[PDB]
A paper describes a structure:
Additionally, we created insertion fusion immunogens by inserting [name] into an [name] loop proximal to the [name] binding site. Insertion fusion immunogens 2 and 3 were constructed by replacing several amino acids in the DIf loop of [name] with [name] and a flanking Gly/Ser linker. Immunogen 3 lacks only amino acids 265-KDESKRNS-272, retaining Cys263 and the disulfide bridge. The disordered DII loop was replaced with a Gly/Ser linker in both of these insertion fusion immunogens to prevent the potential displacement of the fused [name]. In contrast, insertion fusion immunogens 2 and 3 retained the [name] binding mode of the complex but displayed local distortions in loops near the vicinity of the insertion sites, resulting in Cα RMSDs of 0.381 over 232 C-alpha residues and 0.309 Å over 228 C-alpha residues, respectively. However, the IC50 values elicited by the insertion fusion immunogens 2 and 3 were 1.5-2-fold higher (i.e., less potent), and they were significantly different from that of the [name] DI-DII-[name] complex (P < 0.005). Similar to [name] alone, the insertion fusion immunogens 2 and 3 produced potent strain-specific responses but were ineffective in inducing a broad immune response, possibly due to the insertion of [name] in the DIf loop. This insertion results in a loss of strain-transcending functional activity, suggesting that either the local structural perturbations introduced by the insertion fusion disrupt strain-transcending epitopes or epitopes within the DIf loop contribute to protection breadth.
The malaria merozoite protein [name] ([name]) is critical for RBC invasion and is one of the most promising blood-stage vaccine candidates. [name] binds to RON2 through a surface exposed loop ([name]) to anchor the parasite to the host cell membrane prior to internalization into a parasitophorous vacuole. Here, three single-component [name]-[name] immunogens were designed that retain the structure of the two-component [name]-[name] complex: one structure-based design (SBD1) and two insertion fusions. We determined the X-ray crystal structures of SBD1 and insertion fusion immunogens 2 and 3 to resolutions of 1.80 Å, 1.85 Å, and 2.10 Å, respectively.
Numbering used by the authors: 7 to 159, 177 to 209, 219 to 295, 300 to 349
Write the structure that this text describes.
């Protein structure tokens, strides 16, 4: 007897996303006998990036390679021959022009599939696929070489997402081609929604083709998450109030408290939702799936997955 069922489906994080948000390590994959953790969420995480502590290096900088003094880098794939990352949207469309399955794929899905094309060469039967970040401003897809997302002070490295030490990769696309790093690969960090990440989307290998329709992106203006009980949309019974100067800060707080696979698997369970009161500047965070919306002109409904700025009616 709930008329909101279909509308609210995209806010059922456990179902539509199915993995952690702050830290997504929801699946395991073997590469040459060794198990690794890797992101597996089905929805893009809008505005998510990685902040490297004691550094000005943007995390989309390619991972450091070589042995040079002051060697420094980020998380993205280093140069390869041919160059696989970063790749603009038009370069991806031209690169896959002979693959008729990539037609009509939107920017984010194409980027996730591009990142999933590289197989750690030591195991052709491996399901290991690297995650990616799409920059909607420059229209660039960055394949992440490091799948780890948090390290604030070996198996314990594997437990945070340390990927396989891989220098050569085989493409899943046919005809197969082997692509190796031009050099050998050799810090503490945390995920966050920083204002400088506003145009970024963090993408696991599992981002679904139809994310635009099933996943949350825009925050809901004049709306408040509730629970459907006996013909009425009741308030969430238990919330944690936090001060938030605007919607962005509230979305940032929801993201920090959201489902996390950091040491093991949340499967999407967590403080993933927030009702932001724009009059009292309060962020009301909760960990129960909402099943209806309340009409309240002072509220904006947000989720950890949602873009931290964009709103809709």
């Amino acid at each position: 007897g709930n008329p909101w069922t279909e509308y609210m489906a995209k806010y059922d994080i456990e179902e539509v996303h199915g993995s952690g948000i702050r830290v997504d390590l929801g699946e395991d994959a073997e590469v040459a006998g060794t198990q690794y953790r890797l992101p597996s969420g089905k929805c893009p995480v809008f505005g998510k990036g990685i902040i490297i502590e004691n550094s000005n290096t943007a995390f989309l900088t390619p991972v450091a390679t070589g042995n040079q003094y002051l060697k420094d880098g980020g998380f993205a794939f280093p140069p390869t021959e041919p160059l696989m990352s970063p790749m603009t949207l038009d370069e991806m469309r031209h690169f896959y022009k002979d693959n008729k399955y990539v037609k009509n794929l939107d920017e984010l899905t194409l980027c996730s599939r591009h990142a999933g094309n590289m197989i750690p060469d030591n195991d052709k039967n491996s399901n290991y696929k690297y995650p990616a970040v799409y920059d909607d401003k420059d229209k660039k897809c960055h394949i992440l070489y490091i799948a780890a997302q948090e390290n604030n002070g070996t198996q314990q490295a594997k437990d945070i997402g340390a990927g396989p030490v891989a220098s050569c990769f085989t493409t899943r696309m046919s005809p197969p081609q082997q692509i190796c790093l031009n050099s050998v690969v050799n810090f503490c960090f945390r995920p966050a929604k920083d204002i400088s990440f506003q145009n970024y989307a963090y993408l696991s290998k599992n981002v679904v083709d139809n994310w635009e329709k099933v996943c949350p992106r825009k925050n809901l203006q004049n709306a408040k998450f509730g629970l459907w009980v006996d013909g009425n949309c009741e308030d969430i019974p238990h919330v944690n109030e936090f001060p938030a100067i605007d919607l962005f800060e509230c979305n940032k707080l929801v993201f920090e408290l959201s489902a996390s696979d950091q040491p093991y698997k949340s499967h999407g369970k967590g403080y993933n939702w927030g009702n932001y009161n724009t009059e009292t500047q309060k962020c009301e965070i909760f960990n129960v799936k909402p099943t209806c919306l309340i009409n309240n002109a002072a509220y904006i409904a947000t989720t950890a997955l949602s873009h931290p700025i964009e709103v809709e009616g």
